[PDB]
C-alpha cells in the first residue's frame, strides 16, 4: 500500500 | 511564542455533552489544519477529530464518529469539539494539536500540542 | 489494518548511546512516520518526522543528539549521550487517508529510564 498526502483546502 | 490553550473540560455524566475550546495564538492559525488527540488515564494516546485550515475537511475515528463534532473560528483564531451522548471511556485528556505546515510536509505530523484538558465522564 | 508496534520499555545508561525501534505493518513499510516525546506532567512533543530512506526533519528546539533511520519496515530514533532529561515516554505515529478516511495510528509508546 502506498502512504497517500493528508487532504487541506487548496492543495 | 506559539500557543495553544484548551478549556472546557469537566465532569460529565453519562449520556451528557460537552463543548471544548481551544485558543491559538503566536501564528497564523488559518494557515493550519488541527486536530484533537486524547490520551487515557493508561497513558495511550488517541486521534479523534481533525480539521482543515479553511474548514473543507473533517473527519472522525469510528469510536467517535457521530457523536463528536469539530469546529473552529478563524475570525478568533479558535478550534471547538462539541460531544454529545458522553460515554465513562471517553474519559480522556484532551489536547488540541497543529499539524505541520503543509508546505513543510503533507503528510501527518503534529508539531504543537497544546497541555490539555482533563475530562471525566462518570457516574 | 495499519499497525504500529513499539517495545513497552528500555533503560540506557546516561552518556550512552541509545536506539529505540518502531516497526510498520507489512504492507505499511515505506510509510513516513514521526516520533514523540512526553516527558513527566507535559504533553507530547514532537522530536521529528522520518522517511523510508532514513532522511527526517526535526521539530523545534530538539537537541542535535536525536537522529533518525530506517530500515525496512522499522523506524529508529537514536539518542547520542543520553541524558537525563532523556527519561520520558517515546511514542511513534503515522498517519494516512484510505479511501477518503482520514485516519491516525500511535504505537504504544516505549517508556525509557536512564541508568546510572
Known amino acids: 500500500v502506498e502512504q497517500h498526502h493528508r487532504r487541506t483546502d487548496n492543495d | 511564542e506559539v500557543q495553544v490553550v484548551e478549556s472546557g473540560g469537566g465532569l460529565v455524566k453519562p449520556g451528557g455533552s460537552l463543548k471544548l475550546s481551544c485558543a491559538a495564538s503566536?501564528?497564523?492559525?488559518?494557515?493550519?489544519?488541527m486536530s484533537w488527540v486524547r490520551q487515557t488515564p493508561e497513558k495511550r494516546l488517541e486521534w479523534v477529530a481533525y480539521?482543515?485550515?479553511?474548514?473543507?475537511?473533517?473527519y472522525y475515528p469510528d469510536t467517535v464518529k457521530g457523536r463528536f463534532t469539530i469546529s473552529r473560528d478563524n475570525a478568533k483564531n479558535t478550534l471547538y469539539l462539541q460531544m454529545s451522548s458522553l460515554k465513562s471511556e471517553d474519559t480522556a485528556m484532551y489536547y488540541c494539536?497543529?499539524?505541520?505546515?503543509?508546505?513543510?510536509?503533507?503528510?501527518?505530523?503534529?508539531?504543537?500540542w497544546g497541555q490539555g484538558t482533563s475530562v471525566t465522564v462518570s457516574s | 489494518q495499519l499497525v504500529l508496534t513499539q517495545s513497552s520499555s528500555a533503560s540506557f545508561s546516561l552518556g550512552a548511546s541509545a536506539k529505540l525501534t518502531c516497526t510498520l505493518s507489512?504492507?505499511?513499510?515505506?510509510?513516513?512516520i514521526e516520533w514523540y516525546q512526553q516527558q513527566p506532567l507535559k504533553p507530547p512533543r514532537y522530536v521529528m518526522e522520518?522517511?523510508?530512506?532514513?532522511?527526517?526533519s526535526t521539530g523545534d528546539g530538539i537537541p542535535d543528539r536525536f537522529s533518525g533511520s530506517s530500515s525496512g519496515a522499522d523506524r529508529y530514533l537514536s539518542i547520542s549521550n543520553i541524558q537525563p532529561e532523556d527519561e520520558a515516554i517515546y511514542i511513534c505515529?503515522?498517519?494516512?487517508?484510505?479511501?477518503?478516511?482520514?485516519?491516525?495510528?500511535f504505537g504504544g509508546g516505549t517508556k525509557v529510564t536512564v541508568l546510572g
Open positions: 494539536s497543529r499539524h505541520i505546515y503543509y508546505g513543510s510536509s503533507h503528510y501527518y505530523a503534529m508539531d504543537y
Open positions: 503566536g501564528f497564523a492559525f488559518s494557515s493550519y489544519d
Open positions: 480539521i482543515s485550515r479553511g474548514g473543507g475537511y473533517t
Open positions: 507489512r504492507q505499511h513499510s515505506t510509510y513516513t
Open positions: 522520518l522517511k523510508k530512506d532514513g532522511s527526517h
Open positions: 505515529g503515522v498517519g494516512d487517508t484510505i479511501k477518503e478516511q482520514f485516519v491516525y495510528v
